[PDB]
Amino acid sequence: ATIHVDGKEYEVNGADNLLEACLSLGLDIPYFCWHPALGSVGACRQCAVKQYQNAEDTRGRLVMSCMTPASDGTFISIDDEEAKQFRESVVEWLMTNHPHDCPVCEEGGNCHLQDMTVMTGHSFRRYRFTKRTHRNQDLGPFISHEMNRCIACYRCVRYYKDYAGGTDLGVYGAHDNVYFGRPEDGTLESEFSGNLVEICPTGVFTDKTHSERYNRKWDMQFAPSICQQCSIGCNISPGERYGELRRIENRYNGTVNHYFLCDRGRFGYGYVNLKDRPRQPVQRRGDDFITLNAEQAMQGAADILRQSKKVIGIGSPRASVESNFALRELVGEENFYTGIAHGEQERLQLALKVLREGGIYTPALREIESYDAVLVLGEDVTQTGARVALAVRQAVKGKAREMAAAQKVADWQIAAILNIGQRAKHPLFVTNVDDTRLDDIAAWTYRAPVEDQARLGFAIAHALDNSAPAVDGIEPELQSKIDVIVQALAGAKKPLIISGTNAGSLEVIQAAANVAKALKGRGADVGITMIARSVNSMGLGIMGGGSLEEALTELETGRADAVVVLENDLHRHASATRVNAALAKAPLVMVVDHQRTAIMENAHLVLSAASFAESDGTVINNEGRAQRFFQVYDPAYYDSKTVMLESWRWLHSLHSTLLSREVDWTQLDHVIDAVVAKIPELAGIKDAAPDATFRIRGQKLAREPHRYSGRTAMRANISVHEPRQPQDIDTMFTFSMEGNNQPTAHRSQVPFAWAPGWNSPQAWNKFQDEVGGKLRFGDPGVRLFETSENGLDYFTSVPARFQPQDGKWRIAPYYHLFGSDELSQRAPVFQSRMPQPYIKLNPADAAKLGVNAGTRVSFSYDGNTVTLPVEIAEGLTAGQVGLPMGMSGIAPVLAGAHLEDLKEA
């Protein structure tokens, strides 16, 4: 289609409305209620443009550019006097009841309403009467609520209900007394409530964690990074001020995490700002604790390493690719051990084998929203990989989108989309040990142990293609449900199969792979998705190594007299007693970490590593996409005593000092080239982000905005002489505003969104080729592997039916979004949010034990008689005990294990 704006001819996409058709070309129209992902509702009436149907038309009509399709031959005027006066009047009407709260507002300089008040040129107030006020609700530890600043643009209710699926936020009130919130006070229990701080154009829903230690947007030092709290790897923009991480903002990735994060990744950053964190290298002689800087620590570590017969290294799925590779090259290829256990590594290797060898195209997170029928086997997505659950909700609403598009309704008429599709939605079949958070839209939910879920998957795979291995012994009711799932999946056009290593079983992944292979054999565009546990689980599995049991038995047998533990707590993947014995037995433990782990008492040397905010690196998400996360700040700028370096830098300098007795602090590009040289299958991480020599017309990229303040006074308490700003030799960014952050620069890594006249999170519209689509000049991060030409065979080893053995209790994993991450539970803001540790029991088994809810049951696992209060789970199957993974003293390695001595105490 071809449109005419003010006499200028523009080629646009005719399936789009006029608002983002003009926003794609760079034409500024004020707007509040429209969002690129939600749709158009025509509420705020701010997007008015004067439309003409002929080339010679004087009057025209003031039409809504978010509600008028951009067909071929529309002559719209934006800067006309009538349209500008009406837009100014709408801004004025929104400004009649707005409070005088801008200095004391958390979105000052980040406000969409401020940008559209200055954009329309409204600065004179002739309203003289009183302003309406509203009370505020306590929405929990995350969201600060201030309803006086609202403009009734209906974005919060639209996102939270029609997009996030939440049920506790709604619109109440009257004519002008419109309220947006809960029917009472209490925590917003949705797992995607954190995006309300950027969906809301005003300062109603604000980040309370940021509001504790608050600084303005221009005071933030930003960086592009990857969220480390689970395996999805959503792109984030960490921003710091005064040496502590202040706020995690959303970063636009058109393929992964376009406009929405989750609460664990958005509010779980509080572990970085802990004072218990090691900031200097600390060495122990017996009970004496001394502090060294980098050089003497490196020389002493190299001396003790040379005085040992075999140095072993225990990596972690939390650390980056470069740091794990540095440990591997420091300790040797054969002596490198992955920090995960044997079962977790087996499930991870199977998931990687299905991904990069199964011949089935695994889709990205943006591509999930277009799949028709979704089968989730084993994985509790909403509490582990929550963004995949949100994309699953979008793919479910795709059916109503399809019926709406069949009735000649444009895609941006979202109200008509839910109008036509009242309750009809795509099939979703979830399996878990209990009820999930996806049960509101799921076509079926199977509450069963992992053996029965795996057998259900094998039954689906056999009933699709008869060459698949059959399971015998299914009840006819479950057989009818199997037939229903088969009819739903076979009749679809883009089936999706979602599994992962969080189910605690291998046969679940085998069954999901067999279902995907059977769907592929019938001639369908089937996709698969394995959700891993940690952020860099996939990269550690790709690199490989031994299990934690092998490292512990090397330490216990005496063949390893020196162990380097890289960013691992070692109690999350093994028992605490065995780890403590194997570490006290070893005469040298060197823990390189940025967190005060429990094993640092046994550590002979502690090396203060850097977290994601203070280190550069590459992480591989759950779909094989290599992504580079950059440094936000130099920790030594404010606290000059702080010797806190990148873990790969620590290990590479230790390797160099061990070899040639010289200390050589390397660069990130050298380590990246070493990875892509020694490991052929990690060669794609060179293309994840360009090197430190990349310039936009000769200059670097700025980490802080052009109006960064207090350069000559933020360090004046220590010394009045402002030092040289830190130099980033590793990456292409600089710790200064002398850099390029234009929206039209030929780059993919964007630290923050800012345009002249666009200060809100809506400033991301200028950084894309089309608004709501991919990022301009391509999205960052590349896939490590392609789809194979041929796939795997049928996994024949079906499991047996779950028969509850007396005495032994199978442990059913109950993952929580707030508490199952190793680092997110260390945040002090999650302690007021995470639930209490409850052991979950069937009513029948609790009645057999005689225990009621509330009382304490003690259970012993490897000499640890730990007591937990009891919650009753009706959906849990008999013979199991429900345990929360990742909590205090309950490791995720407990999944699938037995539990003897379960008595009331």
Partner: protein
């Protein structure tokens, strides 16, 4: 129809003559808010266009400005030829009362332009400054060396990739090796200028007058060759007062750049503020009310009286009479009391704003203005009868460093010298800015030669005219607003900021990120206290200036200096330095 509108300027006769001479496909015309015909001309035809403008029936006999520009980051270049760098030549025809801006486009690799020194001899320092700050080479230039930065300097400061702040670079550590290297780099090497040190009979002796000389009015160093007392030639070395104010214009916002514009000429103040804020108001589309124009005219004339008083006192002291400078500084204290009353500061007021002024006039400024207007003329008559009619001062001043109209035109001389040469080109009359048409005041024009005495009494008559303007402003003062009602007026009025929310939003977004001027180009040329000061502002649509070019008259006067003092004595050079009215902050910026 407002004066700030983008005028494409095809109605200029010079565009018609250029179309008829070079054809309809030789140059492009740019529509800007500068009020200037902007002609993009190919590099091969630059010398032909310069000769054509030099040989017009009413020709462009003035090279007002010559400077480069980095266009590598300018996103909004619609209607513009493709260019990585550009060079603009601003030329003035006085008899036409017209001016033109010729821009030549250069790629990043092919950064060489034909020289402009032969057509206009004052292009030497401008081409040196363009080479120093942008790296652009001029073919045929005699001595292409750095003029702002020292010879031991790597990189070009005004390029977009060069960092601006000293905290980004390493801090200044002065070691023995660096001190020795920088002291040897600052040493004058006479073979590099072809000085011909010595003669077959007797040797010439080289003297470094500046920096730190009681007659050198600032950071100015001149290296002067003497045979006995006589001067053979002069090498004026500048760059000892460089502050990088243009790079600061690319570093500060529109509102926060006002103190930096104020410190460009530290005896100018509001006179330095006026072209910048007028160019910003041209960019925004703001028409200021009458009271704002009267207030800014009054402050400009007050600071003009202050600057002329200082200039007269320094000239009298440089001749040798050390007495009247104390009384002149007492009248400066009276002016400082008035300026403290109005703006709140003595000498760097930082008071002018976009679309108005900072505060309103306090209750009682007319009393202090009446006291100053009573105090001034008797003191001026005393200074005249004590020193400016002295025959010793006349002997030291009359006939010393005299030049005609052709030397004042080919060297870019403006202000007192240009009017003393008989060229009646005053900005306050020919191109009246800020409502100068509402004030009646005469223009002093000399007899055709620029002596030191002629310049000094022309500045005395300018002081008397400024006193007349102040009297007219005091007797007739409007009663209106002190800020414009435009939404882009920065900052908004304070009381509406304090008790309205739209005004609070506007003020909040205008002091934090800065006002968002649209992507356009503006120019404002005014008559400063020392000559003609002009601001050329290119906006990329952002909240900062994409390019800030400041043309100052003291630069052209200092470049003229070797052509008007050659063959004279050192005493004549001292009197000439005292009778130019230059400051080195104006020269080096």
């Amino acid at each position: 129809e407002p004066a700030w509108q983008t005028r494409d300027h095809l109605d200029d006769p010079v565009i018609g003559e250029l179309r008829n001479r070079f054809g309809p496909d030789a140059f492009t015309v740019q529509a800007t808010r500068t009020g200037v015909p902007v002609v993009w001309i190919k590099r091969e035809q630059l010398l032909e266009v310069g000769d054509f403008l030099k040989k017009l029936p009413k020709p462009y006999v003035m090279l007002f400005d010559l400077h480069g520009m980095d266009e590598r980051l300018r996103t909004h270049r619609e209607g513009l030829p493709a260019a990585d760098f550009s060079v603009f030549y601003h030329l003035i025809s006085i008899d036409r009362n017209r001016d033109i801006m010729l821009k030549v486009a250069l790629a990043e690799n092919d950064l060489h332009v034909p020289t402009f020194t032969k057509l206009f001899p004052n292009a030497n320092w401008y081409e040196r400054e363009t080479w120093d700050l942008f790296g652009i080479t001029f073919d045929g230039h005699p001595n292409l060396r750095r003029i702002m930065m020292p010879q031991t300097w790597k990189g070009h400061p005004l390029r977009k990739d060069y960092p601006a702040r000293a905290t980004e670079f390493s801090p200044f550590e002065l070691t023995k090796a660096k001190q020795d290297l920088e002291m040897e780099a600052l040493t004058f090497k006479p073979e590099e200028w072809g000085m011909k040190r010595g003669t077959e009979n007797e040797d010439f002796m080289f003297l470094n007058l500046g920096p730190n000389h009681p007659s050198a009015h600032g950071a100015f160093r001149i290296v002067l060759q003497l045979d006995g007392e006589e001067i053979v030639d002069c090498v004026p070395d500048i760059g000892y007062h460089h502050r990088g104010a243009e790079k600061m214009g690319e570093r500060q916002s529109w509102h926060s750049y006002i103190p930096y514009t104020d410190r460009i000429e530290y005896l100018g103040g509001c006179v330095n503020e006026m072209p910048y804020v007028l160019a910003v108001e041209k960019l925004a589309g703001i028409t200021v009310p009458d009271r704002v124009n009267v207030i800014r005219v009054m402050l400009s004339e007050l600071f003009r009286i202050n600057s002329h008083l200082l200039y007269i006192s320094t000239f009298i002291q440089d001749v040798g009479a050390m007495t009247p400078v104390f009384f002149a500084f007492t009248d400066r204290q009276k002016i400082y009391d008035l300026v403290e009353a109005i703006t709140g500061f003595r000498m760097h007021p930082a008071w002018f704003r976009i679309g108005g002024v900072a505060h309103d006039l306090p209750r009682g400024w007319d009393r202090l203005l009446r006291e100053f207007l009573d105090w001034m003329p008797k003191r001026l008559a005393s200074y005249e009868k004590a020193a400016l009619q002295n025959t010793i001062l006349k002997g030291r001043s009359q006939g010393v460093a005299a030049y005609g109209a052709k030397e004042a035109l080919e060297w870019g001389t403006t202000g007192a010298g240009l009017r003393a040469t008989g060229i009646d080109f005053d900005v306050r009359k020919a191109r009246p800015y800020s409502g100068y048409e509402n004030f009646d005041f005469e223009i002093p024009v000399g007899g055709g030669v620029s002596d030191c005495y002629t310049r000094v009494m022309l500045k005395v008559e300018e002081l008397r005219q400024s006193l007349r303007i102040l009297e007219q402003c005091l007797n007739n003062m409007p009663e209106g607003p002190f800020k414009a009602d435009h939404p882009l007026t920065t900052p908004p009025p304070k009381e509406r900021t304090l008790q309205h929310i739209e005004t609070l939003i506007t003020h909040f977004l205008q002091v934090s990120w800065g006002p968002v001027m649209p992507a356009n180009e503006s120019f404002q040329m005014i008559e400063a206290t020392k000559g003609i000061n002009s601001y050329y502002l290119t906006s990329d649509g952002s909240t900062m200036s994409y390019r800030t070019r400041i043309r100052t008259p003291s630069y052209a006067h200092l470049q003229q200096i070797p052509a008007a003092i050659r063959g004279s004595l050192v005493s004549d050079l001292i009197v000439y330095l005292g009778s130019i009215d230059f400051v080195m902050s104006d020269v080096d910026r």
